[PDB]
Short mmCIF file of C-alpha atoms in Angstrom, two decimals:
data_model
loop_
_atom_site.label_atom_id
_atom_site.label_comp_id
_atom_site.label_asym_id
_atom_site.label_seq_id
_atom_site.Cartn_x
_atom_site.Cartn_y
_atom_site.Cartn_z
CA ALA Q 243 0.00 0.00 0.00
CA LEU Q 244 3.13 2.17 -0.14
CA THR Q 245 4.32 3.56 -3.48
CA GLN Q 246 7.88 4.73 -4.11
CA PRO Q 247 9.58 6.17 -7.21
CA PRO Q 248 11.38 3.46 -9.20
CA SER Q 249 14.57 5.51 -9.64
CA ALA Q 250 16.33 8.50 -8.10
CA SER Q 251 19.92 9.63 -8.49
CA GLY Q 252 22.29 12.51 -7.95
CA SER Q 253 25.93 13.44 -8.36
CA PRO Q 254 28.33 13.23 -5.39
CA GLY Q 255 27.43 16.23 -3.26
CA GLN Q 256 23.88 16.65 -4.60
CA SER Q 257 20.63 15.83 -2.79
CA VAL Q 258 17.77 13.51 -3.74
CA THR Q 259 14.19 13.15 -2.52
CA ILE Q 260 12.29 9.84 -2.37
CA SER Q 261 8.51 9.86 -2.00
CA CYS Q 262 6.34 7.32 -0.17
CA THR Q 263 2.57 7.52 -0.69
CA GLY Q 264 0.18 5.44 1.39
CA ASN Q 265 0.93 7.17 11.60
CA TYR Q 266 4.72 6.93 11.71
CA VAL Q 267 7.12 6.39 8.81
CA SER Q 268 10.40 4.45 8.79
CA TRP Q 269 13.06 3.99 6.12
CA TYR Q 270 15.66 1.30 5.42
CA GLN Q 271 18.97 1.27 3.56
CA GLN Q 272 19.93 -2.03 1.91
CA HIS Q 273 23.16 -2.37 -0.02
CA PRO Q 274 23.17 -5.09 -2.71
CA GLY Q 275 23.74 -8.51 -1.18
CA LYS Q 276 23.20 -7.14 2.33
CA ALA Q 277 20.52 -7.03 5.01
CA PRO Q 278 18.36 -3.91 5.45
CA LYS Q 279 19.39 -1.37 8.09
CA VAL Q 280 17.31 1.27 9.85
CA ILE Q 281 18.35 4.81 8.95
CA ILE Q 282 15.10 6.66 9.73
CA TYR Q 283 12.46 5.87 12.36
CA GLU Q 284 9.45 7.76 13.73
CA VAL Q 285 9.01 10.11 10.76
CA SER Q 286 12.31 12.00 10.99
CA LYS Q 287 14.33 10.65 13.94
CA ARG Q 288 17.68 8.97 13.33
CA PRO Q 289 19.33 6.07 15.18
CA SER Q 290 22.93 6.09 16.35
CA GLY Q 291 25.59 5.86 13.66
CA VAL Q 292 23.40 7.44 10.97
CA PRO Q 293 25.06 10.72 9.90
CA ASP Q 294 23.18 14.00 10.07
CA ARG Q 295 23.08 14.19 6.25
CA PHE Q 296 20.07 11.84 6.31
CA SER Q 297 16.67 13.38 7.00
CA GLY Q 298 12.98 12.66 6.59
CA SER Q 299 9.64 14.42 6.72
CA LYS Q 300 5.92 13.84 6.23
CA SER Q 301 3.38 16.33 4.84
CA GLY Q 302 -0.07 14.83 4.29
CA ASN Q 303 -0.40 11.35 2.81
CA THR Q 304 3.20 11.24 1.50
CA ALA Q 305 6.51 11.07 3.36
CA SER Q 306 9.88 11.97 1.87
CA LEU Q 307 13.42 10.75 2.55
CA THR Q 308 16.19 13.19 1.59
CA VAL Q 309 19.93 12.43 1.55
CA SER Q 310 22.24 15.44 1.26
CA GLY Q 311 25.91 15.29 0.33
CA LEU Q 312 25.67 12.03 -1.57
CA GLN Q 313 28.50 9.51 -1.12
CA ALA Q 314 29.37 6.26 -2.88
CA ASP Q 315 28.03 4.27 0.09
CA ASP Q 316 24.58 5.79 -0.49
CA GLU Q 317 24.24 3.80 -3.73
CA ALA Q 318 21.76 1.20 -2.49
CA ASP Q 319 18.07 0.31 -2.31
CA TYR Q 320 15.75 2.25 -0.01
CA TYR Q 321 12.33 1.19 1.30
CA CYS Q 322 9.64 2.83 3.43
CA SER Q 323 7.69 0.63 5.85
CA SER Q 324 4.51 1.42 7.79
CA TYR Q 325 4.19 -1.20 10.55
CA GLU Q 326 4.26 -4.34 8.40
CA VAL Q 327 3.53 -3.00 4.89
CA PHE Q 328 6.64 -2.41 2.78
CA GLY Q 329 6.97 -0.12 -0.21
CA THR Q 330 8.01 -0.89 -3.76
CA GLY Q 331 11.50 0.52 -3.22
CA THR Q 332 13.75 3.14 -4.78
CA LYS Q 333 17.19 2.71 -6.37
CA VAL Q 334 19.68 5.48 -5.46
CA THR Q 335 22.87 6.01 -7.55
CA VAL Q 336 25.73 8.52 -6.95
CA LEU Q 337 26.03 9.05 -10.76
CA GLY Q 338 29.43 7.28 -10.52
CA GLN Q 339 29.93 7.32 -14.32
CA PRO Q 340 28.51 9.65 -17.07
CA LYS Q 341 24.72 9.22 -17.59
CA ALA Q 342 23.59 7.09 -20.57
CA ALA Q 343 20.14 6.83 -22.13
CA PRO Q 344 18.73 3.28 -22.32
CA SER Q 345 18.71 1.44 -25.63
CA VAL Q 346 15.43 -0.37 -26.30
CA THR Q 347 14.81 -3.18 -28.80
CA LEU Q 348 11.46 -5.00 -28.92
CA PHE Q 349 10.90 -8.33 -30.69
CA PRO Q 350 7.46 -9.74 -31.59
CA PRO Q 351 6.69 -13.43 -31.00
CA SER Q 352 8.18 -15.73 -33.62
CA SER Q 353 6.24 -17.79 -36.14
CA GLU Q 354 7.68 -21.01 -34.71
CA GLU Q 355 6.57 -20.07 -31.19
CA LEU Q 356 3.04 -19.26 -32.40
CA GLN Q 357 2.77 -22.76 -33.89
CA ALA Q 358 3.32 -24.16 -30.38
CA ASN Q 359 0.37 -22.08 -29.07
CA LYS Q 360 2.82 -19.74 -27.32
CA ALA Q 361 3.86 -16.11 -27.66
CA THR Q 362 6.40 -13.96 -25.82
CA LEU Q 363 7.32 -10.29 -26.21
CA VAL Q 364 11.07 -9.83 -25.70
CA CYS Q 365 11.98 -6.26 -24.73
CA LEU Q 366 15.72 -5.71 -24.25
CA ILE Q 367 17.31 -2.75 -22.45
CA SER Q 368 21.05 -2.11 -22.43
CA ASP Q 369 23.64 0.65 -21.97
CA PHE Q 370 21.89 2.76 -19.34
CA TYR Q 371 23.26 4.46 -16.23
CA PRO Q 372 21.99 4.67 -13.51
CA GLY Q 373 20.84 1.04 -13.36
CA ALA Q 374 17.13 1.55 -12.72
CA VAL Q 375 14.30 1.40 -15.27
CA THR Q 376 10.48 1.41 -15.23
CA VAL Q 377 9.01 -1.02 -17.77
CA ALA Q 378 5.23 -0.84 -18.23
CA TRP Q 379 3.72 -2.82 -21.11
CA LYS Q 380 0.83 -1.15 -22.93
CA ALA Q 381 -1.91 -2.97 -24.87
CA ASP Q 382 -3.57 -0.36 -27.13
CA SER Q 383 -2.95 2.25 -24.43
CA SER Q 384 -4.12 0.14 -21.47
CA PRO Q 385 -1.38 -1.27 -19.22
CA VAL Q 386 -1.34 -5.00 -18.50
CA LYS Q 387 0.14 -6.49 -15.32
CA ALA Q 388 -0.41 -10.23 -15.82
CA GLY Q 389 2.38 -12.06 -17.62
CA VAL Q 390 4.96 -9.32 -16.97
CA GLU Q 391 8.36 -10.69 -15.91
CA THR Q 392 11.10 -8.05 -15.60
CA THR Q 393 14.66 -8.65 -14.42
CA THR Q 394 16.83 -6.31 -12.36
CA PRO Q 395 19.74 -4.31 -13.83
CA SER Q 396 23.12 -6.05 -13.80
CA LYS Q 397 26.60 -4.71 -14.50
CA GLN Q 398 27.83 -5.07 -18.08
CA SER Q 399 31.45 -5.18 -19.26
CA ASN Q 400 31.46 -1.37 -19.69
CA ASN Q 401 30.36 -0.43 -16.13
CA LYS Q 402 26.79 0.19 -17.38
CA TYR Q 403 23.67 -1.87 -16.66
CA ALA Q 404 21.54 -4.30 -18.67
CA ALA Q 405 18.10 -5.81 -18.17
CA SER Q 406 15.37 -7.70 -20.01
CA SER Q 407 11.58 -7.75 -19.75
CA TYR Q 408 9.22 -10.41 -21.10
CA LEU Q 409 5.44 -10.28 -21.58
CA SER Q 410 3.99 -13.78 -21.96
CA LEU Q 411 0.85 -13.73 -24.11
CA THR Q 412 -1.47 -16.26 -25.69
CA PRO Q 413 -1.85 -16.35 -29.50
CA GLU Q 414 -5.53 -15.39 -29.23
CA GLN Q 415 -4.92 -12.17 -27.29
CA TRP Q 416 -1.80 -11.32 -29.32
CA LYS Q 417 -3.84 -11.23 -32.53
CA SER Q 418 -6.85 -9.49 -30.96
CA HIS Q 419 -4.94 -6.46 -29.67
CA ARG Q 420 -3.85 -3.99 -32.33
CA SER Q 421 -0.35 -3.41 -30.94
CA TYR Q 422 1.82 -3.73 -27.85
CA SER Q 423 4.37 -1.29 -26.44
CA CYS Q 424 7.37 -1.53 -24.11
CA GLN Q 425 7.55 1.84 -22.34
CA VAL Q 426 10.66 2.26 -20.17
CA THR Q 427 11.18 5.24 -17.87
CA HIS Q 428 14.70 6.31 -16.85
CA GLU Q 429 14.23 9.10 -14.28
CA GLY Q 430 11.45 10.81 -16.20
CA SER Q 431 12.78 9.81 -19.65
CA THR Q 432 10.18 7.57 -21.30
CA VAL Q 433 10.92 5.98 -24.69
CA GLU Q 434 8.30 3.73 -26.29
CA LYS Q 435 8.93 0.86 -28.71
CA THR Q 436 5.79 -0.48 -30.39
CA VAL Q 437 5.32 -3.68 -32.39
CA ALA Q 438 2.26 -5.01 -34.21
CA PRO Q 439 1.31 -8.46 -35.53
CA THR Q 440 1.91 -9.16 -39.23
CA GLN V 115 26.29 -7.26 22.13
CA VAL V 116 23.19 -8.35 20.19
CA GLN V 117 23.66 -10.98 17.48
CA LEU V 118 21.24 -12.91 15.24
CA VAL V 119 22.95 -15.86 13.53
CA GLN V 120 20.65 -17.99 11.37
CA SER V 121 20.96 -21.45 9.85
CA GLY V 122 22.84 -22.29 6.67
CA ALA V 123 21.49 -22.18 3.15
CA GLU V 124 18.92 -24.85 2.29
CA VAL V 125 17.68 -26.43 -0.94
CA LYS V 126 14.19 -27.93 -1.08
CA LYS V 127 11.73 -29.27 -3.66
CA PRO V 128 8.12 -28.28 -4.40
CA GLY V 129 5.93 -29.43 -1.53
CA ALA V 130 8.85 -29.76 0.90
CA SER V 131 9.39 -27.99 4.23
CA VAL V 132 12.34 -25.97 5.52
CA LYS V 133 13.12 -24.83 9.07
CA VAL V 134 15.20 -21.70 9.73
CA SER V 135 16.77 -20.93 13.11
CA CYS V 136 17.66 -17.54 14.62
CA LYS V 137 20.24 -17.65 17.42
CA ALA V 138 19.86 -14.72 19.82
CA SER V 139 22.36 -13.52 22.42
CA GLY V 140 23.27 -10.50 24.50
CA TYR V 141 19.73 -9.32 25.25
CA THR V 142 16.48 -10.30 26.96
CA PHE V 143 15.19 -13.00 24.62
CA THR V 144 11.60 -12.89 25.89
CA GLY V 145 11.43 -9.10 26.23
CA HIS V 146 11.52 -8.25 22.52
CA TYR V 147 9.36 -9.56 19.69
CA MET V 148 10.91 -11.53 16.84
CA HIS V 149 9.76 -10.89 13.27
CA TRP V 150 10.41 -12.81 10.05
CA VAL V 151 10.61 -11.06 6.67
CA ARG V 152 11.40 -12.62 3.28
CA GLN V 153 12.69 -10.97 0.11
CA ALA V 154 12.74 -12.64 -3.29
CA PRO V 155 15.83 -12.01 -5.46
CA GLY V 156 15.23 -8.64 -7.07
CA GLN V 157 11.98 -8.03 -5.16
CA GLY V 158 10.99 -6.07 -2.07
CA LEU V 159 10.60 -6.98 1.57
CA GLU V 160 7.51 -8.91 2.69
CA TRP V 161 6.50 -9.23 6.34
CA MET V 162 5.54 -12.77 7.36
CA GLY V 163 4.76 -12.63 11.08
CA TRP V 164 5.94 -12.01 14.61
CA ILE V 165 6.11 -14.28 17.66
CA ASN V 166 6.28 -13.21 21.30
CA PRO V 167 9.18 -15.15 22.89
CA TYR V 168 7.52 -14.88 26.31
CA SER V 169 4.02 -16.31 25.77
CA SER V 170 4.89 -18.06 22.45
CA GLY V 171 1.94 -16.27 20.84
CA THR V 172 2.12 -15.68 17.10
CA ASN V 173 0.40 -13.30 14.66
CA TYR V 174 0.96 -14.55 11.11
CA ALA V 175 0.33 -12.61 7.92
CA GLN V 176 -2.97 -13.06 6.10
CA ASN V 177 -1.31 -14.46 2.97
CA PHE V 178 0.76 -16.92 5.04
CA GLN V 179 -1.89 -18.16 7.49
CA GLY V 180 -2.19 -21.94 7.50
CA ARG V 181 1.24 -22.38 5.88
CA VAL V 182 3.87 -20.91 8.25
CA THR V 183 4.62 -21.92 11.84
CA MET V 184 6.82 -19.90 14.20
CA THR V 185 8.20 -21.30 17.46
CA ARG V 186 10.85 -20.33 20.00
CA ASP V 187 13.28 -22.01 22.39
CA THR V 188 13.99 -20.42 25.77
CA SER V 189 16.92 -22.66 26.76
CA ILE V 190 19.04 -21.89 23.68
CA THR V 191 17.36 -18.51 22.93
CA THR V 192 16.67 -19.48 19.31
CA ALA V 193 13.62 -18.55 17.23
CA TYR V 194 12.34 -20.92 14.55
CA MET V 195 10.20 -20.47 11.44
CA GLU V 196 9.06 -23.45 9.35
CA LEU V 197 7.23 -23.08 6.03
CA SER V 198 5.49 -25.94 4.21
CA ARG V 199 4.21 -26.45 0.66
CA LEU V 200 7.18 -24.60 -0.79
CA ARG V 201 6.88 -23.58 -4.44
CA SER V 202 9.25 -22.26 -7.09
CA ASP V 203 8.03 -18.72 -6.33
CA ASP V 204 9.00 -19.03 -2.64
CA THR V 205 12.73 -18.73 -3.41
CA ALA V 206 13.74 -15.85 -1.13
CA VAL V 207 16.19 -14.74 1.55
CA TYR V 208 14.67 -14.92 5.03
CA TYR V 209 15.81 -12.56 7.80
CA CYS V 210 14.89 -12.55 11.49
CA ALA V 211 14.63 -9.09 13.04
CA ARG V 212 14.18 -7.93 16.63
CA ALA V 213 11.69 -5.43 17.98
CA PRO V 214 13.76 -2.63 19.60
CA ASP V 215 11.78 -2.56 22.86
CA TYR V 216 8.32 -3.10 24.34
CA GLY V 217 6.65 0.09 23.12
CA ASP V 218 8.25 0.07 19.66
CA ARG V 219 7.79 -3.26 17.88
CA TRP V 220 8.29 -2.47 14.17
CA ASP V 221 11.55 -0.47 13.88
CA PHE V 222 13.78 -3.54 13.61
CA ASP V 223 17.11 -2.40 15.07
CA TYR V 224 18.87 -5.75 14.51
CA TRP V 225 18.77 -8.09 11.51
CA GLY V 226 20.20 -11.52 10.84
CA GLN V 227 22.64 -12.40 8.09
CA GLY V 228 19.85 -14.18 6.21
CA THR V 229 19.13 -17.75 5.13
CA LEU V 230 18.81 -18.25 1.38
CA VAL V 231 16.18 -20.90 0.50
CA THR V 232 16.24 -22.22 -3.06
CA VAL V 233 12.98 -24.12 -3.75
CA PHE V 234 14.27 -26.50 -6.58
CA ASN V 235 12.16 -28.39 -9.16
CA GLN V 236 11.70 -29.61 -12.81
CA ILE V 237 14.73 -29.48 -15.10
CA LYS V 238 13.71 -29.12 -18.76
CA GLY V 239 15.10 -28.86 -22.25
CA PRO V 240 15.14 -25.25 -23.42
CA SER V 241 12.85 -24.11 -26.23
CA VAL V 242 14.65 -22.07 -28.90
CA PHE V 243 12.75 -19.75 -31.25
CA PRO V 244 14.39 -17.39 -33.77
CA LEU V 245 13.97 -13.62 -33.48
CA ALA V 246 13.63 -12.24 -37.00
CA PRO V 247 14.81 -8.61 -37.52
CA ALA V 248 18.78 -4.44 -37.67
CA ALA V 249 19.01 -6.89 -34.76
CA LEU V 250 18.32 -10.63 -34.70
CA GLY V 251 18.54 -13.15 -31.89
CA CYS V 252 17.15 -16.31 -30.30
CA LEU V 253 14.80 -16.90 -27.37
CA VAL V 254 15.80 -19.57 -24.83
CA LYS V 255 12.51 -20.15 -22.99
CA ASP V 256 11.46 -22.52 -20.20
CA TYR V 257 14.77 -24.04 -19.13
CA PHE V 258 16.20 -25.01 -15.75
CA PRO V 259 18.67 -24.72 -14.10
CA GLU V 260 21.37 -22.15 -14.86
CA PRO V 261 23.39 -21.73 -17.00
CA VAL V 262 22.96 -22.01 -20.79
CA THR V 263 25.78 -21.40 -23.27
CA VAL V 264 24.69 -19.48 -26.38
CA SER V 265 26.93 -18.97 -29.41
CA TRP V 266 26.53 -17.97 -33.06
CA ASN V 267 27.84 -19.94 -36.06
CA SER V 268 29.68 -22.26 -33.65
CA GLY V 269 31.54 -19.30 -32.19
CA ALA V 270 32.40 -17.63 -35.50
CA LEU V 271 30.66 -14.37 -34.47
CA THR V 272 31.46 -12.77 -31.11
CA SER V 273 31.11 -9.00 -31.68
CA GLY V 274 27.72 -7.45 -31.00
CA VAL V 275 26.46 -10.55 -29.17
CA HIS V 276 24.68 -9.62 -25.93
CA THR V 277 23.52 -12.50 -23.71
CA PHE V 278 20.95 -10.86 -21.45
CA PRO V 279 20.51 -12.39 -17.97
CA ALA V 280 17.64 -14.82 -17.60
CA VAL V 281 14.38 -14.02 -15.79
CA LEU V 282 13.07 -16.07 -12.86
CA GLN V 283 9.52 -16.65 -14.07
CA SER V 284 6.59 -17.38 -11.77
CA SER V 285 6.72 -21.00 -12.99
CA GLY V 286 10.31 -21.43 -11.77
CA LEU V 287 11.79 -21.63 -15.28
CA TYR V 288 14.35 -19.19 -16.68
CA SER V 289 14.10 -17.30 -19.97
CA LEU V 290 17.23 -15.87 -21.62
CA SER V 291 17.60 -13.85 -24.83
CA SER V 292 20.80 -13.36 -26.85
CA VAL V 293 20.81 -10.99 -29.83
CA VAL V 294 23.37 -9.65 -32.30
CA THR V 295 23.80 -6.42 -34.25
CA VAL V 296 24.16 -6.66 -38.03
CA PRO V 297 24.68 -4.00 -40.75
CA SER V 298 21.56 -5.25 -42.61
CA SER V 299 23.81 -8.21 -45.14
CA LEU V 300 20.81 -10.21 -43.92
CA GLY V 301 20.42 -12.07 -47.21
CA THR V 302 24.11 -12.95 -47.53
CA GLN V 303 25.26 -14.00 -44.05
CA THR V 304 23.58 -16.98 -42.39
CA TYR V 305 23.00 -16.80 -38.63
CA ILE V 306 22.56 -19.93 -36.49
CA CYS V 307 22.34 -19.81 -32.69
CA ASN V 308 23.82 -22.76 -30.77
CA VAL V 309 22.33 -23.27 -27.30
CA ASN V 310 23.80 -25.98 -25.06
CA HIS V 311 22.34 -26.94 -21.67
CA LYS V 312 24.56 -29.53 -20.00
CA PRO V 313 22.24 -30.38 -17.03
CA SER V 314 19.49 -31.63 -19.36
CA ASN V 315 21.85 -32.61 -22.23
CA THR V 316 20.04 -30.49 -24.82
CA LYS V 317 21.87 -28.93 -27.78
CA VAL V 318 19.67 -27.46 -30.53
CA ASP V 319 20.77 -25.22 -33.41
CA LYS V 320 18.20 -22.79 -34.85
CA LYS V 321 18.71 -20.54 -37.88
CA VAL V 322 17.20 -17.04 -37.68
CA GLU V 323 16.10 -15.35 -40.90
CA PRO V 324 13.59 -12.54 -41.67
#
């Protein structure tokens, strides 16, 4: 019941703001391959060991977590929790390397796959920094949630990130809908790739 | 000092049961609640339930009621959480966290190192379908387990080949896509993708053309 922005980033020394729309509010910092740690509790209070550069606030139905003077250690996942409900999460990056726009390539289901009563939309994203995207499949303008399987960004051989998203569809619904789109958002930068049957 | 050391990594099968321990020391074991939270690889945190170490009373989550059991041991100050009817979608890292005090019971000030569970199941020969273009590739769908080696023209082409990481589907099977970049040249050069999966002994070559 808690919604967070998919991505948020800033250069070393900048500041970023992470929203949490849904009482008290608490935030967690989780480095990759590590357990979550409390950094914010009771709206804006901080535990011991958390530097003063971390701060929080709440105004209405949304609470914000702001980190000032960004450091390399701040590059991690952040979640907001209300009692037991956890948020979607936000990926923070200290813009370590120059920014790069994602490259999107969408493939329609193959003829051989359709003969086996199967269909899969392969959307491929590569060469994007920071490593955080927002893939939302569109079926004639209406988003579809079922059958969506999206990976998480992983380091490439050029310090950038790569990911892949798949939309499993049946042959009947693939032919019925006019077209499908793979819209990916990279910190407010949405690029849409659309494919159509035949 | 407060420590929470859990059990080692476990591998189970669909329908099996796994028990995870949580060794507690350096604090009043029965004075602070113990909570269990799981997180799938690449997903968010999901609260499962809390158990009072004093009265052994539990309050499970709605989506886990009738499937998870949480116990505690006073003599060895260890909390336990056993989950039955494991599925391929239950692969997650499970952490045990401590309520900071009596009044505050949700700001978990201490977390365990985690216990990775790996619900394991059906192997399967991968299904290869060409991706006609420009860029052309092949779709390795419904295979298990990792990894799969994908080449082009028996290794003749290696520039522009991008083997994207596989996706952990809800069915427990991985799906990987490898594509190449071509000048498009499509009618002259022939492209064949060689996928080899040693665990299932499946090697199929598929030619991709527009």
